[PDB]
Amino acid sequence: GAHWGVLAGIAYFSMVGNWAK
Numbered sequence: 029g030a031h032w033g034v035l036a037g038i039a040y041f042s043m044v045g046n047w048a049k
Contacts (some may be wrong), residue, residue, distance in 0.1 A: 032039070
């Protein structure tokens with residue numbers, strides 16, 4: 029299904045994107 033092992037960084041960066049502001 030979802031390859032989080034290689035996409036876990038995407039979810040991490042998405043939060044940093046919301047966090048940065």
